[PDB]
Symmetry: C2
Subunit: 324 residues, 2 copies
């Protein structure tokens, strides 16, 4: 992924911003005098393999010149991993930090105000509609979904604060689905969710009250439904459930819950505009429709969900900008 | 778990109130002239056992007098099971339905105002404290929120006597917790899940704040189940397949504790947010979810206390699962008086 942008290279430095999250690392960088912003994401399971990516970026995109490279660490792990970064990059020009929430908002404000065709709405009926934000904006909520959910309130440029988030985020969904279905990739989980029918494992309004009917009353609610002396308890231990239906059920459960909490926070704070960031939606139409419908449903259309083409890079983008 | 209460028995109709949820049926009745309220719960899964309990109640506590028994059904299942009740009780005096929300609030208000030793607070530091709501000394009682947790989560706001309405609830309730843990861990009963949760350590599957930020407190949960995908064309999955793949990589008590915290913290947060929106300080929990389980009650209480900086308070009920059946019972008692 790349964006054309006339960057300022007055410091003659290769700036490399890294958002160090709980599960994923996101980098934003620009080869000097290239006027291209580049974006990359890695799954930092083994910290060794994440340092090795940074080395490869410096080698491939700055001629291996550590002395002309400045690293900006952001994300939740920025202050934590600062010393380790210095241990791993002794020849670096410098390493600085940028606080997580300020990184997110500076990066989001940059994408809203500077980058065209970056903000969009999505639902299954109207499709994707690009919002010409870089051509009303404030106040807004940013719901940043990754390792847990962070929710930030922005009333005007450079004025933001944290409101209550949630531990039921992308890591919960991927962790549950990985363990239950054995899926190894987010794309396998989302492909299954797209085809699945949650009604085989969810209790719907119709299932409680008998024959909106398709509204979910209890996510996964259909599943639970001295010494040995009788037959083994293998009848219930052997009940089987469809992987696509499980994926759709838990994608709905997690996304609808995020959307509700986001709605309630926007209601408390008198906010109409809700941006979703982080690596959660992945541009997937089912996930986006679910989050957008949740906001529309609870507000009867008086609040609006917005998505971002570079949703996963908000924090690293803000950190990149803080360098120069 | 009976209660003494001086009832007027009217024309001596034996009122049998049933709250039928997604998985449980809750029954309230009073033998004629006994001045005792009696309570029983049974799963609805096996219909013959559910109906057999109601027959046993009539035979043992109303001398087998079907002709003077009135069944009043409430809860979501009151519609789905109406024909079953008609089929199973052909000699009965009558069968009626009572609206779900009205049942819950009429029952809760009765317990709050009339029944001693019924409302209590609990957390790990303070222990259990009984609240004397039924004694002398409205501005302390109303307004309040009822968070009724069964398969899903229903949330009702009560501003004053007879003034109540529904607000946004949640599909992540007890059915979600039970469904996930029974599939993943093979727990046989809700009580076994709770015992396993009591023993577990969620830090082996959850990402804590300290995991991400180093040194919200460090021990707070940042990502429920967040260590699992990190450390991790078949159509069907089962417990056996999950178990045969996981292979003790993640321990069942740790999984139970993590998801108990995740579901409970989430319910507490949504309750807090609805109470914030509606400027309510008193939050009652109803249903079959807390079950007097200290860890669950502490978790819910801490969530409300945390987000509100101490200004809101979680309340629990000794007869939490019976609110709707109690409301229905009171309506039928009024009709037969
Ligand atoms: Mg610094």
């Amino acid at each position: 992924q790349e964006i054309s942008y006339n960057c300022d290279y007055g410091d003659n430095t290769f700036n490399l911003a890294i958002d160090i999250g709980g599960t994923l690392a996101k980098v934003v960088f620009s080869p000097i005098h290239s006027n291209r912003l580049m974006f990359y994401t890695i799954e930092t399971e083994k910290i060794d393999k994440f340092m090795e990516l940074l080395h490869s970026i410096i080698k491939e995109h700055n001629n291996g010149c550590y002395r002309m490279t400045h690293i900006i660490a952001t994300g939740g792990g920025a202050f934590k991993f600062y010393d380790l970064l210095y241990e791993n990059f002794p020849q670096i020009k410098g390493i600085s930090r940028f606080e997580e929430m300020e990184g997110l908002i500076h990066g989001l404000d940059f994408f809203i105000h500077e980058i065209p065709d970056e903000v969009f709405t999505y639902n299954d009926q109207d499709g994707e509609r690009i919002i010409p934000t870089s051509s009303a904006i404030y106040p807004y909520l940013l719901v940043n979904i990754g390792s847990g959910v962070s929710i930030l309130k922005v009333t005007e440029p450079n004025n933001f604060s944290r409101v209550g988030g949630s531990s039921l985020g992308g890591g919960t969904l991927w962790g549950l689905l990985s363990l239950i279905t054995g899926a190894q990739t987010y794309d396998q989980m989302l492909d299954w969710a797209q085809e699945g029918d949650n009604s085989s494992v969810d209790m719907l309004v119709g299932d409680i009250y008998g024959t909106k009917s398709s509204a979910i009353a209890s996510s996964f609610g259909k599943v639970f439904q001295l010494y040995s002396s009788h037959e083994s308890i293998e009848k219930n231990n052997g009940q089987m459930f469809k992987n696509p239906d499980i994926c759709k059920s838990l994608l709905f459960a997690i996304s609808n819950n995020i959307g509700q909490i986001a709605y309630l926070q926007a209601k408390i704070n008198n906010i109409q505009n809700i941006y979703f960031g982080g690596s959660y939606t992945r541009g997937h139409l089912t996930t986006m429709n679910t989050l957008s419908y949740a906001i529309n449903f609870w507000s009867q259309g008086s609040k609006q969900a917005f998505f971002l083409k570079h949703e996963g890079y908000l924090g690293a983008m803000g950190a990149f900008l803080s360098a120069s």
